[PDB]
Amino acid sequence: GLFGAIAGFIEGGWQGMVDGWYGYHHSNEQGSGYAADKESTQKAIDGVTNKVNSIIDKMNTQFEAVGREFNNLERRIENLNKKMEDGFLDVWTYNAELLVLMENERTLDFHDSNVKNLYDKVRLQLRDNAKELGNGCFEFYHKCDNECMESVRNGTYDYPQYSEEARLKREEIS
Amino acid sequence: GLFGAIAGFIEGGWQGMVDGWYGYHHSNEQGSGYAADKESTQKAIDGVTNKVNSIIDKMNTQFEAVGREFNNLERRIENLNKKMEDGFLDVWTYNAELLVLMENERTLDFHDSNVKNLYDKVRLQLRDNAKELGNGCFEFYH
Amino acid sequence: GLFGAIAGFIEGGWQGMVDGWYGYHHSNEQGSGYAADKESTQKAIDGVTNKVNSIIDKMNTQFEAVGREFNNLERRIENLNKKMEDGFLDVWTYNAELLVLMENERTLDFHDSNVKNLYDKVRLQLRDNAKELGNGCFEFYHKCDNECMESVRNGTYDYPQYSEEARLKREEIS
Amino acid sequence: GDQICIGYHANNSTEQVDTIMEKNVTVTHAQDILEKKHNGKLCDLDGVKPLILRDCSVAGWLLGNPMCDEFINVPEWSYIVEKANPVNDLCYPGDFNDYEELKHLLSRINHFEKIQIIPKSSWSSHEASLGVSSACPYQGKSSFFRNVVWLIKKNSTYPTIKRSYNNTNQEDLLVLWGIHHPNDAAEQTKLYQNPTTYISVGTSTLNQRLVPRIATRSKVNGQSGRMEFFWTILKPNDAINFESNGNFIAPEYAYKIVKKGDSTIMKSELEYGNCNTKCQTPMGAINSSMPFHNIHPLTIGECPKYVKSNRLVLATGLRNSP
Amino acid sequence: GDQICIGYHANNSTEQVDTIMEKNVTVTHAQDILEKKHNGKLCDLDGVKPLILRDCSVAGWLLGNPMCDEFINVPEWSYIVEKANPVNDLCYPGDFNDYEELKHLLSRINHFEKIQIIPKSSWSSHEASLGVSSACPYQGKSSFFRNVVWLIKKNSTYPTIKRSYNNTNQEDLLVLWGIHHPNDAAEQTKLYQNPTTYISVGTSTLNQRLVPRIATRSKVNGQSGRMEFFWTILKPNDAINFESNGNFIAPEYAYKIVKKGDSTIMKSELEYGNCNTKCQTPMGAINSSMPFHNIHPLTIGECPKYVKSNRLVLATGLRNSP
Amino acid sequence: GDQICIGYHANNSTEQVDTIMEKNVTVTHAQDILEKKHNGKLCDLDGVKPLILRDCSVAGWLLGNPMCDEFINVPEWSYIVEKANPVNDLCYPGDFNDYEELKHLLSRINHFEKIQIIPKSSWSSHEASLGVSSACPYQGKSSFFRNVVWLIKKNSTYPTIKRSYNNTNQEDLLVLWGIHHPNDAAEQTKLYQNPTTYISVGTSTLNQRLVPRIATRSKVNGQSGRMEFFWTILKPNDAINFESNGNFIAPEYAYKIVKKGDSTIMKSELEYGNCNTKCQTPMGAINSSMPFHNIHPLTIGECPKYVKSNRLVLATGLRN
Ligand SMILES: CC(C)N1CCC(NC(=O)c2c(Cl)cccc2Cl)CC1
Ligand SMILES: CC(C)N1CCC(NC(=O)c2c(Cl)cccc2Cl)CC1
Ligand SMILES: CC(C)N1CCC(NC(=O)c2c(Cl)cccc2Cl)CC1
Ligand SMILES: *[C@@H]1O[C@H](CO)[C@@H](O)[C@H](O)[C@H]1NC(C)=O
Ligand SMILES: *[C@@H]1O[C@H](CO)[C@@H](O)[C@H](O)[C@H]1NC(C)=O
Ligand SMILES: *[C@@H]1O[C@H](CO)[C@@H](O)[C@H](O)[C@H]1NC(C)=O
Ligand SMILES: *[C@@H]1O[C@H](CO)[C@@H](O)[C@H](O)[C@H]1NC(C)=O
Ligand SMILES: *[C@@H]1O[C@H](CO)[C@@H](O)[C@H](O)[C@H]1NC(C)=O
Ligand SMILES: *[C@@H]1O[C@H](CO)[C@@H](O)[C@H](O)[C@H]1NC(C)=O
Ligand SMILES: *[C@@H]1O[C@H](CO)[C@@H](O)[C@H](O)[C@H]1NC(C)=O
Ligand SMILES: *[C@@H]1O[C@H](CO)[C@@H](O)[C@H](O)[C@H]1NC(C)=O
């Protein structure tokens, strides 16, 4: 899509992550596992729920057809009546179908953007203390135990604490 | 927002910058201060002014209600008349409100994109000549 | 443009590339040349063709005006008729003009996004094996013959094969 | 080395949505916003039964076609249901003046109280009991509309009728009468004696003089004669005055308008379902919180908004990995 | 070391806007595009005063109900104002034929020049001064519509009227006449002598023969009789021809159509406010450069476009930092 | 060092498009979606010729105004074309009752076949050949509408007419008749003898009694009298019965409705152009795959959708 993240530089989704829309897979010595980003998932829920409610409410004032009857010498106004009612039904059908098409496109791109922004949040935390694999994954230049990983998730990673160790491994490998 | 710059990697706006929409804060030996990017601010003004004028003029061709009167044995056409007029008023009200909602969202994202692009303009100039702090600021290596 | 690529960090377009919308200019020892990215150009064609077809089909059920005639003592319904028909003509004219304005803006930004994503596809392949000039161009730290270039185009660049040579040219040797 | 990866949700969802540039996009979550289902029958509306006219037209009901005796005294209704082509209409052939304007008024009425305004037994100078036809059968015997009286000459004489009714009720009254258009001068003489006749009718607003028309007509339900019916709304404290020397189909019963509100005349062949709904269509009742439906445009009650669409699904979640 | 920072404007602005996904978003700059204010008065439109009928209906004005003498000669108008239920209408009760079609024509007219086409004094075989009623009082004395003449028998005779008027003007002429429907045959004799009467009226297009209807009616303003009024547009060089042996309410004054243009008949209970405006509504005038308003749908002049919205604000600036 | 660059297409294109925020944006490729051109002619519609009434009104055609003999027998049509103000209408002045409802019915009809319901030769107690006027000339001689008969008294008598016709056809019949409103009681006597006259007309649904009206009228085409015409649809197996003692403009020919379908009455001053089209407007025919046009709102056939726009161009390619 527009932001390059979903079905882009991140090739696929995780059946494994069940309790979130966006988040993380960590793999250290303690072992692997999935964890959802609560903050960005909740922000996305608020946005989509508001959008659905906004689309419904904007259609509160839509045209309501009424039965009128005409005799056999009132064919002109019978036809005027039928065209007026069909006319409004076709206008409100177009409005509903188009609003849904256009907001569906914005919703998918909204998700694409939320993933890209989550990835950038992490990249700007880790800086040269990790390697960008280009598949959504960051290979750490240091050891990052389950309590280091959580510091990345909650957005309080101490860059100086690990930078000296990271430099020694980085200048070694590259 | 969509582009991740406004209330994103740039945490907040500057009360200090008064004469522009987007720009710079410098702090060298001569001292600190704010300066607006004239080029990107003017491009944004041109775009928004055109958008406002485009929304107004697209509503030049909107439905105008007329008084028609009917006697007590013309209730069917009286009711047809009232529903036709209310019908068009509801269609043009929906058109106005939706266009404003949709273009408001694009305007805020337009600003978000202009800021991200200003930051990238500078990054691609400075390259390794400066350090990216990740808060919108570049520490110079001179 | 929203995505910063077209008439942005890529200063202008190539008269030289004729058989594609987006692609590459390579210049090695074997000599220069243009090549179009088939995959992203075809995806963009599919998208725009679907958009044109979607806009046309949404206007299949547009209002059709009918001739009705009225005598000299039917002026009120003659006027009702004329305003009803003009009313729907104005509604469908606004719908057509607005949909075209709004989708034109999305089309130009779609192209801007496709170019940005093509550039990022290549950057995430080349990693530190090449230098980002900041004008859309990557200077390789190794030799990249016409068969290396194609590996970048078709999206199967072997990063490990060239990483050791790339490091020796990039860094001080010892 | 240790790894942290950024990713997004995927699942076994098969739910599809459309966009401008792409059709049939699988997503992880969606909201269908279109009701497509109904119960296929006619229900009470917020506890109140509709008036279901079965084989009777509104005209059949209000004039009292003898085949419409089930509707002689109807309780309060929520809406009215009429078949496209009811067979029990004007049993004696003819016309109902401003019929569509009457049906339009009926759309704002929930209850009538039938009232005797001119007793059939009060016609002492005219025969009130010979006004019957084989066109209007009841149980194999010639009959007539029950709410009006076809007056005939008595002892070869038809004196001039001068009769009033004052609406001493606090409600509007729907009043119905008619004229007989005979086949020929001989029929005129046989029924009414007087050769040149009229019916005058006055209220505060009405100023009518009807003349019978002789013409040679095709037999309908075995009759070449025609009855032509007329109506008015008689406001509180107004009076209606009738004068006639023949061809008068006089009121006996009229209808007091005792409850006004939202109603409609719904065209439907469907059956009563002994059910309750908040939303009725001519194809069936709807029970839904969905904001849209595609059942039928002509609904009554608290209904979703009608659209012609076969499918309306909002994307809520992400593009799904197949 | 040295720093350069990229950033964006923020300010003291409290101005809020809405989007699909978020309500009540504070921004740095916005444009309100909805006019919500009016001056609560009826004003001149670009310097031209409206015709304000006060307690008079269009019918009361054009037939000249004696309570409508303020409108005996009205100057050029921008628009017309009529109350919902004007008390001065048909003082003698009855009907105005094709009244709503006449009001529709009036909506395209800015000026009439009233002219005497048949002087009241020119009726030498009929009484032209006895046509008065207690239904149409002027200063506690019996009177009548001023623009038409109720003709009565003279010396127990009503000869056949033959009168023509030729439109020798360059403009269309609106011509008004009427028929009297009495209460009884005795009243017919008393007023007109002849028991069987007609009014024939011919132009190049019109072919009318009116007959009175005698019937007993409810009293309205003390009268059981009814007047029924008719009108036509007499083209330049066409003639109108009247023939009658009774019940004729003859024209005296007719209206030359001297200015056509945009006008309207606006329903308002308000009175004149001695102001000027480019845009008038029935609730008050608008002075605005805003492109939309929510005052009332039925406006006249150079007006913003009407919408039902309570609020319309376009985002111009950025999302604002607290 | 070896280089790879990412780029995008540019070209010699001058094609411009609009967006909300920017007008007159040059692009590499675009699709115009608005048809603006027509051939300026009236054409056959999918191989079927229209009925082009030239100087005749629908009334002139159906009553048979003698200037309308070109239309005495018309083949199946695709649509009808009438001028704004046709000169050949009611040659004898008067009125056509529910005329606009008749034209509305005609809009759903592709073919009429003329049928004789009352033979001109069957009027043996009345003069059938004196019913002519200088208002209705044919070749410098007084004439009359050809589809109806103006009956006159014979030898100072007008016996009561009783005539019936039973619709033994599978199709609806359009039937036309009329009444004469004379100038005075003297004219009434001269033409019809009987001073007090009527026309009664009955079917299964119709119950009409017409009375002439004497009024003093301005001359139109030299006449102060007026003819007033009436019509009905006679269903299969129903009968129409006429009775009159004067002022009767009696049917001779009526119209079988043999083909119903999509048709229209189109107002145009143009004449036939010996062309074929799938889409006709009053200003000319359209041959286009474009989804929109701005020619005229009132079209017939497989047409693009009408809009009031001067310009509609979709961006397909890139900014140039
Ligand atoms: C629990 C989590 C994995 N997801 C995210 C939230 C939930 N939301 C939606 O799909 C949604 C739906 Cl299905 C309807 C209206 C609004 C929303 Cl946000 C779907 C389940
Ligand atoms: C600080 C100053 C340069 N700003 C930015 C531009 C200015 N303009 C607008 O907001 C605007 C407005 Cl307020 C109305 C119409 C069009 C526009 Cl562009 C608002 C004030
Ligand atoms: C190099 C060339 C084949 N490109 C690819 C797309 C081609 N076609 C279009 O722009 C197009 C047009 Cl002109 C109409 C409808 C759909 C499309 Cl994709 C023109 C430019
Ligand atoms: C989407 O899938 C269903 C499968 O039955 C089908 O009806 C519909 O036409 C499909 N649309 C496209 C464009 O493939
Ligand atoms: C019938 O009425 C006439 C007078 O109108 C009268 O002479 C006759 O006796 C009446 N007959 C009966 C039996 O009432
Ligand atoms: C927006 O704020 C205003 C107060 O200025 C208030 O009227 C309104 O309820 C708020 N709306 C929402 C949805 O929060
Ligand atoms: C009808 O009767 C009421 C008394 O209940 C009276 O006020 C009114 O004047 C009467 N109306 C007529 C027209 O006789
Ligand atoms: C009206 O008078 C003019 C001029 O005297 C004359 O030419 C015209 O024929 C008259 N119109 C009628 C209808 O008699
Ligand atoms: C370019 O823009 C103007 C409006 O800004 C418009 O009139 C026209 O379509 C374009 N070409 C001109 C002015 O020649
Ligand atoms: C006219 O009327 C009678 C027929 O009864 C007779 O005097 C006369 O011969 C008739 N015919 C002609 C042609 O005079
Ligand atoms: C017309 O003719 C047929 C066949 O003789 C007959 O069945 C039908 O009843 C006739 N219609 C009328 C109205 O007499």
Author numbering:
A (entry chain D), C (entry chain B): 1 to 174
B (entry chain F): 1 to 142
D (entry chain C), E (entry chain E): 10 to 331
F (entry chain A): 10 to 329
Paper text:
Infection by influenza requires the viral envelope protein HA, which mediates entry of the virus into the appropriate target cells through a series of orchestrated steps. During viral maturation, HA is glycosylated, and it assembles into a homotrimer anchored to the membrane by a transmembrane domain. In addition, each HA protomer is processed by cellular proteases to form HA1 and HA2 subunits, which remain associated through noncovalent interactions and a disulfide bond. Subsequently, the pH of the endosome is acidified, which triggers the loop to helix transition in the “stem loop” region of HA2, resulting in a large conformational change from the “neutral pH structure” to the “low pH structure” of HA.
To understand the structural basis for fusion inhibition and give guidance into future efforts to optimize this class of compounds, we determined the crystal structure of CBS1117 bound to H5 HA (A/Vietnam/1203/04 [H5N1]) at 2.20 Å resolution. For this analysis, crystals of the trimeric extracellular domain of H5 HA were soaked in a cryosolution containing 5 mM CBS1117, as described in the Materials and Methods section. Analysis of the resulting electron density maps revealed three CBS1117-binding sites at symmetric locations on the H5 HA trimer. CBS1117 binds near the HA fusion peptide (residues 1–20 of HA2, shown in red) with a closest heavy atom approach of <5 Å but relatively distant from the HA stem loop (residues 59–74 of HA2, shown in blue) with a closest heavy atom approach of >17 Å. CBS1117 binds to the HA surface at a site between the HA1 and HA2 subunits of a single protomer with the compound forming contacts with HA1 residues H38, Q40, and T325 and HA2 residues W21, I45, and T49. Specific types of intermolecular interactions include hydrophobic (residues HA1-H38, HA1-Q40, HA2-W21, and HA2-I45) and polar interactions between the chlorine atoms of CBS1117 and side chains of residues HA1-T325 and HA2-T49. Thus, the compound appears to stabilize the prefusion HA conformation by bridging interactions between the HA1 and HA2 subunits with very little structural change in the side chain conformations of the HA binding pocket (RMSD value of 0.26 Å between apo and compound bound HA for all atoms of 32 residues that are in closest proximity to the binding site). HA1-H38 has recently been proposed by our laboratories to be part of a pH trigger through its interaction with HA1-H18 and relatively close proximity to the fusion peptide, and thus, the close proximity of the CBS1117-binding site to the histidine pair may disrupt the triggering event and subsequent membrane fusion. HA1-H38 interacts directly with CBS1117 via hydrophobic interactions and presumably the loss of this interaction at this position results in reduced binding of the compound. Moreover, the presence of a glycosyl group at HA1 position 38 may be expected to further diminish compound binding and potency in group 2 HA due to steric hindrance.
